[PDB]
């Protein structure tokens, strides 16, 4: 068997999920094993240009056994390709859904027409020699054998290493546009704009963006609509700056925002993030329309069954659904966190906890300052992420 270092790339569409995808495809693979995958990287498109072309990459490598021969696992990385969604060969370098490169086969060297091993520009660029170095920290290009590889990885400028990564927990980071995060000066409101760079910067794989408060004791159709798309809008404005490109979740109780915000963006929408039931029937006609995740609260067992009927009932796959047990919505809490594992094997769905700053589920006195709050969000997340929930909510990481 030999271990295969493939290098992969993306510049567009769910960037982070296009790598999860083809990662989980060739783990899907009886004569394939993952022994590794490596830490996550940015850096600027490198072209060779219409200005479109440059939006920020998203580079890793993962490291694996197999007994496929190069030839044979250059036709199965092909084939991944497309099944993720790669286009007819097009244009010389421009925005890719997937990019799945053979850079190294331990200390093969494979000079042919259509494979060369190491990969030709393996040592030329930072984005695929960082993540593989991170992977073999020993390995020396076997046409090289002098050359320091790390020195060379000096010679190649800075790159920057994300903390985003490829676990199986990510982190949601909360947006919020409410009166709540108000702070907004005479010729500036950039609160909203600075709590996204920051959330980005920290390790935030999702964003949730929701524009009604968040405190118990509304605003109106259009109101909230805006609040939305203004940020949205904002957002696709700085695709291209974000060093990591997040998934976005919206936040919103009224099927009519949902419906507004989708017709306009549903191409940078991942997931719907309902906190009341409504109209749950027409609320999965539109989800499963736009294909999107959408989220089943407890606003247990059968009341998320129940819920989860009709969304099947109306066309949408139960692989798109989570639930979440909906802490701070009604001691009670910390029974059913200590037994989330179990809920989420009955119910059959993924899990979505948003433990942040709530109290309860925390165990702290309601009295809690911020830091208090935060700390222990923290060190619970850490529990969470050991325990693999798969998405946690929280308001800093
Ligand atoms: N180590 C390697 N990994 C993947 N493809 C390789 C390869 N060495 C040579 N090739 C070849 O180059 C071909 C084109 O693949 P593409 O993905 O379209 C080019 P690219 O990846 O965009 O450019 P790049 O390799 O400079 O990054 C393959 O069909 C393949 O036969
Ligand atoms: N930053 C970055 N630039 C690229 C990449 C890549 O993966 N990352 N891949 C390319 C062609 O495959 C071309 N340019
Ligand atoms: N899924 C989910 N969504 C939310 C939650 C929450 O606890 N879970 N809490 C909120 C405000 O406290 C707002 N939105
Ligand atoms: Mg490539
Ligand atoms: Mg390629």
Same mark, same amino acid.
């Given at each position: 068997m030999v271990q295969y270092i493939i290098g992969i790339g993306t510049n567009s569409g769910f960037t982070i999920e296009n790598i999860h995808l083809a990662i989980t495809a060739l783990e899907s693979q009886q004569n394939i094993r993952i022994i590794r995958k490596a830490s996550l990287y940015s850096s600027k498109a490198v072209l060779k240009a219409p200005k479109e072309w440059d939006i920020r990459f998203?580079?890793?490598?993962? +490291? *694996?056994?197999s007994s496929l021969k190069p030839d044979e696992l250059l036709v199965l990385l092909k084939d991944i390709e497309l099944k993720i969604?790669?286009?007819?060969?097009a244009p010389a370098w421009s925005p890719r859904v997937i990019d799945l490169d053979i850079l190294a086969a331990e200390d093969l060297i494979l000079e042919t027409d259509k494979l060369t *091993?190491?990969? $030709?520009?393996?040592?030329?660029?930072?984005?695929?020699?960082a993540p593989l170095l991170e992977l073999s920290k020993g390995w020396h290009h076997p046409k090289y054998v002098e050359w320091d590889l790390n020195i060379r990885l000096k010679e190649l400028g800075e790159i920057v290493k994300l903390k985003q990564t490829l676990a199986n927990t990510i982190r949601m980071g909360i947006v919020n546009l409410s009166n709540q995060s108000f702070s907004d000066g005479n010729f500036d409101?950039?609160?909203? $704009? /600075?709590?996204?760079?920051?959330? *980005?910067?920290?390790?935030?794989?999702i964003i949730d963006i929701g524009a009604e408060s968040t405190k118990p004791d509304p605003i109106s159709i259009e109101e909230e609509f805006n609040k939305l798309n203004e940020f949205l809008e904002y957002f696709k404005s700085q695709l291209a700056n974000l060093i990591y490109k997040p998934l976005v979740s919206i936040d919103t109780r009224k /099927? &009519?925002?949902?419906? +507004? %915000?989708?017709? $306009?963006?549903?191409? %940078?929408?991942?997931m719907?993030?309902?906190? &009341?039931?409504?109209?749950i029937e027409q609320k999965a006609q539109l989800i499963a329309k736009y294909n999107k995740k959408y989220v089943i609260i407890h606003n247990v067992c059968d009341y998320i069954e129940q819920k989860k009927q009709i969304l099947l009932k109306h066309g949408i796959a139960q692989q798109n659904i989570y639930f979440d047990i909906g802490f701070?919505?009604?001691?009670?809490?910390?029974?059913?966190? &200590?037994? *989330?594992? &179990?809920? +989420?094997?009955?119910?059959? /769905? +993924?899990? /979505?906890?948003?433990?942040?700053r709530k109290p309860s589920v925390l165990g702290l006195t309601k009295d809690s300052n911020l830091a208090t709050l935060d700390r222990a969000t923290r060190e619970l997340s850490r529990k969470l992420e050991k325990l693999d929930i798969d998405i946690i909510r929280v308001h800093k990481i």
């Open positions: 998203l580079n890793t490598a993962v +490291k *694996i056994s969604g790669r286009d007819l060969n *091993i190491p990969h $030709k520009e393996l040592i030329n660029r930072s984005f695929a020699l409101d950039n609160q909203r $704009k /600075l709590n996204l760079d920051e959330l *980005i910067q920290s390790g935030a794989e /099927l &009519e925002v949902m419906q +507004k %915000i989708l017709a $306009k963006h549903h191409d %940078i929408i991942w719907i993030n309902d906190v &009341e039931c409504n109209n701070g919505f009604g001691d009670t809490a910390r029974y059913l966190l &200590e037994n *989330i594992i &179990e809920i +989420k094997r009955r119910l059959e /769905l +993924k899990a /979505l906890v948003g433990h942040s």
